Amino acid sequence: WAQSRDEQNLLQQKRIWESPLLLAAKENNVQALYKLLKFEGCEVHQKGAMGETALHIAALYDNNEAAQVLMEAAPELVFEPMTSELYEGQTALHIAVINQNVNLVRALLARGASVSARATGSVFHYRPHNLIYYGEHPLSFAACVGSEEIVRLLIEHGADIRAQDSLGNTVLHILILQPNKTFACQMYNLLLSYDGGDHLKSLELVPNNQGLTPFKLAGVEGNIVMFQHLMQKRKHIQWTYGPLTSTLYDLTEIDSSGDDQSLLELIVTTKKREARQILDQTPVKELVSLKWKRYGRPYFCVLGAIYVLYIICFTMCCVYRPLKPRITNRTNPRDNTLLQQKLLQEAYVTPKDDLRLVGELVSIVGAVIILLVEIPDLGGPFHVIIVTYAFMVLVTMVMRLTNSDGEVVPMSFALVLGWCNVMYFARGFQMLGPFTIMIQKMIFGDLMRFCWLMAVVILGFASAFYIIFQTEDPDELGHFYDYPMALFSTFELFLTIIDGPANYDVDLPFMYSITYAAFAIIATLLMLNLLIAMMGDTHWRVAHERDELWRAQVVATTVMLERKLPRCLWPRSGICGREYGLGDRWFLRVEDRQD
Ligand SMILES: [Gd]
Ligand SMILES: [Gd]
């Protein structure tokens, strides 16, 4: 796809070179334009490669004298839009506006160019492969280029500010996505001055078709300067007492009013790295901290203590599993057998068995509750693990009633997934809070690396030992008696957790002594470079990423409790405007001191 526009751009410059009209429009040769138009007559409605006219070419390369000649000899080329799919809708006005050619925009509105002609070309879309996104209307182009003179000059000739594009975005939404944040704020105020002036149907209330007001889009897109500037409209200073200044906050589009209309939900669910800084701002950081200090932090410990007791319940049901002897003379064929199955399905022989039967019941009603609260549908694995645990618990009771050999298989999987999920609640303890995010964000880029390497090193050295020790007998050292144990023993050797094969009575093969020296070296070099490369995330900027991501998790988890829990507890944050001078809106009282 990228080569197409590269081809069509090289194709355009070829057609400009071929057509002497389009060449004179690109080179601003007024001497040749009159020779081509008045003397030896040519097609003045000539269409270029990109569906352009000679006027569109004269507007690209800022050439005013050529454009005026093209309009004095054919004033209908102004209404002419670009016809190609890449520029479907662009007019000669859009090119002059985005080039900030005020004299050409002035002359184009004299001819009466449509200030409402959309530009639906593919290069005008809000896509990553396009370097910019200025919208579709000429009013939106002047707002993005930072030319306040063209903006009002377009409104003078009937430009509509309510004009939404394909994505249902007004000119306000488009400025929020722009890079030059420090200059677009004055442009944002200039556009609002032309509003209707009534409290209803304001331009700041017109939502993006993704359900986003311009204020809401600022926080989602991580636009701090626009969020701060948009916040001036929604805060009421109460009084000024020396350095102290008690101010009131609107809390309308913030907090959690509507289901998905809440902004806090949008900030924690977005993948935008910049959005995590919005909840650190002075309307939100007061809110989220009050929602946590009370009603947030305590309820997280209640659910945690309940889950800790629920798992220690199921743990006891496993350590006190059913009992039964071997009941088979099987421990002689393949005399390495070791099993003593404790699996009989008894019926209510309970001097102390019903104590775990209710524990088996508690483990089931808790697992079906866990399944019926998380499957009806950052903290990711610590909620995918719980549904897999409750899946293993339900398979554990399915492992019963069939009495299969692998009774312990789904039960041992549930015993580890259920416990290691307790450090999910570690994200709300100050100390190991950021620790849990450190071990979590390390499973991706710093765990799969050096394991694909370690796995390839084992695949090499482990299999060699099998060949070396498939000749000798396993009665002696035996670390590699079959190919699976040839791999598993060397894996343990890679982490030095095994003492290394060493027998000093017999004579070891001539290749083991050489290969293990090379193993002890490479298994430690790849163990040290795993330590150093992993470290490389200890910058002073990471000191925030260690903390403000944990706070983002605490803020995200604080929103998790407020949605599902009932309304008898956790009252709405702030104080309602009703029964006060305000009106049925909830406000936060925050005061500060300027030094
Ligand atoms: Gd032996
Ligand atoms: Gd040892």
Swiss-Prot record:
The chain holds residues 69 to 677 of 767 of the full protein. Residues 320-356, 401-406, 470-482, 503-513 are extracellular. Residues 1-298, 427-446 are cytoplasmic. The modification Phosphotyrosine is found at Y133, Y134. A motif (Selectivity filter) lies at residues 498-502. Keywords: ANK repeat, Calcium, Calcium channel, Calcium transport, Calmodulin-binding, Cell membrane, Glycoprotein, Ion channel, Ion transport, Membrane, Metal-binding, Phosphoprotein, Repeat, Transmembrane, Transmembrane helix, Transport. ANK repeats lie at residues 16-46, 50-79, 88-117, 134-163, 167-208, 210-239. This is Transient receptor potential cation channel subfamily V member 6. The gene is Trpv6. One of its GO terms (molecular function) is calcium channel activity. The keyword Repeat applies. The chain crosses the membrane at residues 299-319, 357-377, 381-400, 407-426, 447-469, 514-534. Glycosylated. Residues 555-559 are annotated as: Interaction with S100A10. It catalyses: Ca(2+)(in) = Ca(2+)(out). GO terms for biological process: calcium ion homeostasis; calcium ion import; calcium ion import across plasma membrane; calcium ion transmembrane transport; calcium ion transport; parathyroid hormone secretion; protein homotetramerization; response to calcium ion. It is found in: Cell membrane. Residues 483-502 dip into the membrane without crossing it. It comes from Rattus norvegicus.
